[PDB]
Amino acid sequence: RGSIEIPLRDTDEVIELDFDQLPEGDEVISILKQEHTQLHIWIALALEYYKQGKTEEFVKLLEAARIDGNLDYRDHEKDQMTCLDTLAAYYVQQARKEKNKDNKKDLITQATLLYTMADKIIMYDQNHLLGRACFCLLEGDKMDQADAQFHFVLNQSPNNIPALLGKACISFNKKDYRGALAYYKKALRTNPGCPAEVRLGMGHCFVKLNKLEKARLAFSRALELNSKCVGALVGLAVLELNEKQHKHDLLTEPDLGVTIDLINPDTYRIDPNVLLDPADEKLLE
């Protein structure tokens, strides 16, 4: 599955951690602290815990790295941005799910303070702006502000999947659903391996754009790729029942069920081998 090398300080040796053998989160931290490990390694370990579903290990690694992650290397700043923006992004995703109103407000505060201090390191780091953009969507009428940040990212990186998904969502909420569908379609064409929820959001465009048919094929492709996908079950199970447009207004979450993943750098990595599979190729016509 993989391993990571931890340079032992004042030595030419190294200790390997096997990812299938991931130690207790708390002892890893004392190791990286003891060997004054550079920040970039702390982050690598933390994301691996995130991938293995070991979430509190991931949180505690990166919070610890803010104190004892060594910065004695060129481009450490970019790693501080990754560390702060990934902490912030995670707290936001906990905030959406959390039901204690008081607890949720604390998560938001933590994300706010993290983004504010990441502002003072690399003001315009692409990932950072994607974080602030999605954070604008989280709540406000910061829709215009989020739109400007997403749009600026595509004026540097036209194929950036998070920015396209962000533009699609904003397009939909201002009810330009041809534009929202185009954005979603470009996301999926560009990165055939993208999350199942991309077709979910295409579904909702395919519903408001009165193309009821592919709307169902979109929702179905989502459940095929992740049978847990709920807003698509909701989606299909309201194609049952024939303005008409409104009943489809309030089953749709504001993020149209499409969460933009700012934590796992893999979610939109583009393997040149993965090819468009015909069920998506039909939705793209």
Numbering used by the authors: 3 to 244, 1067 to 1109
Article sentences:
The highly conserved eukaryotic multifunctional polymerase-associated factor 1 (Paf1) complex (Paf1C) was originally identified in budding yeast over 2 decades ago1, and robust data suggested that it plays a vital role in transcriptional elongation and chromatin modifications. Our results clearly reveal that the heterodimer of PAF1/CTR9 or Paf1/Ctr9 is the core component and is important for human PAF1C or yeast Paf1C assembly, yeast viability, and Paf1C-mediated histone modifications.
However, we succeeded in obtaining crystals of the single polypeptide created by the fusion of CTR9(1–249) to the N-terminus of PAF1(57–116) with a tobacco etch virus (TEV)-cleavable segment. The crystal structure of CTR9(1–249)–PAF1(57–116) was determined at a resolution of 2.53 Å and with one molecule per asymmetric unit. In the final model, all residues were clearly visible, except residues 1–2 and 246–249 of CTR9(1–249) and residues 57–66 and 110–116 of PAF1(57–116), presumably owing to conformation flexibility. The structure of CTR9(1–249) was composed of 12 α-helices and two β-strands at the N-terminus. The helices α1A to α5B contained five sequential helix-turn-helix repeats that exhibited structural similarity to TPR. Like multiple other TPR motifs, the five TPR units of CTR9(1–249) were arranged in parallel with adjacent α-helices to each other to create a right-handed superhelix. Region I was mainly maintained through four conserved hydrophobic amino acids (L80, V82, I84, and L86) in PAF1 and corresponding amino acids in CTR9 by hydrophobic interaction. The binding of Region III was largely mediated through hydrogen bonds by several pairs of amino acids between PAF1 and CTR9: D104/R201, D104/R223, and K106/K216, which formed an extensive network of hydrogen bonds.
